[PDB]
Amino acid sequence: SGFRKMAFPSGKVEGCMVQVTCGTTTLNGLWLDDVVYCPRHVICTSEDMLNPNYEDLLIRKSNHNFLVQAGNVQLRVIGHSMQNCVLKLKVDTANPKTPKYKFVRIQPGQTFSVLACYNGSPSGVYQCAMRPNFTIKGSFLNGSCGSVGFNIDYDCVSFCYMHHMELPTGVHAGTDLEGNFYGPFVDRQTAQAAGTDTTITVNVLAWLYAAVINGDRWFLNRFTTTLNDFNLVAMKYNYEPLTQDHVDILGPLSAQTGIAVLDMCASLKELLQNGMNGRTILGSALLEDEFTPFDVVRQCS
Amino acid sequence: SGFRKMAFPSGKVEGCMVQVTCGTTTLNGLWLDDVVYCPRHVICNPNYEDLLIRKSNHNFLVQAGNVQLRVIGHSMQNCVLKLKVDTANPKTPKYKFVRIQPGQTFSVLACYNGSPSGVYQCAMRPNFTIKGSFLNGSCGSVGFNIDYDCVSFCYMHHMELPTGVHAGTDLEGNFYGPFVDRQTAQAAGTDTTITVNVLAWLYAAVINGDRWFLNRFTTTLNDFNLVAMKYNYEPLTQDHVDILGPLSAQTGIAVLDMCASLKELLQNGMNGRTILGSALLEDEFTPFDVVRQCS
């Protein structure tokens, strides 16, 4: 029993975090093979934040403009390049702690564990989802950039996020490991801000099935719905439209509990219209949406 | 900005987890030096002295991944088993064996077949249980804290209670709470909410932009304690007030002034608004954890 926001063990990734300095700016890098990855806004300056021209900035730069330290061991840079908004630093030594890894680009709604570092040392790990508006509600302080979020299937780490910036609203944003931003965000000084978000519908359902497994049923009602009847209501409460692809994905929880997707959809519809009447679900007074169906099966039975 | 249920990096502890088989029972062990620690209910109206006397070193199969470890001795300390092995753990960190107090948090690395599954954050509830997440074969899983380089082990998972909360020992084998590793009626005793952690959580909201609950009122320490009991809260002491000072100085909100914000919420609710993405008060954040995670 029990249901927690659970993150993956961070050990595999701890051995990859190093300190990257360019001039007076420091942030974190990710040491994978003989290459170190970090956000390109490290090569910025005061004078340039408003519209930096990143090709020039890097052309005026030598491998010696980058100080990489892996713990106490200083690393020697032997090349420098930029892929979109990520910098690629070749070092003289490949990391023997390089785990089996992948570079995945996730979809809005998927989740990942985040190992936040400052000065290349880990502080902690926690669980996030990529919002529909491509932000994440993380916990980041000055100099956490280069920190990565990630997932693990057995022995293989799939990297899916790199921390780049904090917005006026206090949520965060970044790139995949190719340098492509999640969302309409750009590493320079503009007025960009977060656009109105929705609730991830399949995730609440994924969370509702988790509640049943753990004894939470007061919200179960005897009714069923159509997908459209359900979809009508969900829009009206700023929920994401639900698809048959989501329904198919939700099946395995359906078979285990014996509750039809649409039949559990009739309960979620009732909750949106009558509230929780004070009651909690899974120790929570809100409808959570940062759990994917996979995460529940992962944590549950 | 932002405030998350944040756990310690698990790497230092991942290097200590092994798979322990005793007859037909498997669970996790914690490999430290040439010694492995695990719950003694692995050897199962019992008699653990008798049972262990009837047990030989080969009755325990310890495997660190594929590296099987050879047991060369076995002893029992309270409710934890100590198996001396032929090999010390080279990934043995600088560590401690501590025992926490009700209210104190710790990170939980849940393991199955000696492999870690995930990491999350816990509080020791007043009734010495923990609201964790454990499935079959997670026993032996550990909780802990970390101060820079030293692992402070403070919990070992043993059992799950009828209510779906959990219970275990310190690393000396003493159970947290009135729980015992045998088939009895033990169950969770009425639980109370940890006020200083709620208050510490309120300072976190200000730091992170949630401020609507700040009011012009104040209370006495006693006045507040009176009301808090009436809502099944723990009494607050001057030590808790002292404990909260550094967050008070940081935010510029008096402890006793923040008690007036919390006093309002207990009797009037959040009237629907959220605090730190939560429609309830959160009491599993300590003053330290906030400082550790915040500016």
Ligand SMILES: COc1ccncc1C(=O)N1CCN(c2ccc(Cl)c(Cl)c2)[C@H](C(=O)NCc2cccs2)C1
């Ligand atoms: C208190 O600092 C933080 C809090 C939470 N998460 C991260 C940080 C953090 O490390 N930060 C330091 C680097 N900086 C930066 C600088 C240049 C670029 Cl080009 C970019 Cl993209 C990011 C973060 C930023 O957004 N700065 C303001 C912006 C600049 C450009 C777009 S917005 C702030």
Ligand SMILES: COc1ccncc1C(=O)N1CCN(c2ccc(Cl)c(Cl)c2)[C@H](C(=O)NCc2cccs2)C1
């Ligand atoms: C689904 O299984 C779990 C779910 C969540 N957390 C843990 C487990 C888990 O691994 N479990 C397997 C071992 N077992 C056990 C057996 C003997 C002893 Cl003597 C003790 Cl102490 C514990 C756990 C138990 O409580 N079993 C019932 C009890 C026996 C004695 C007191 S209560 C259940």
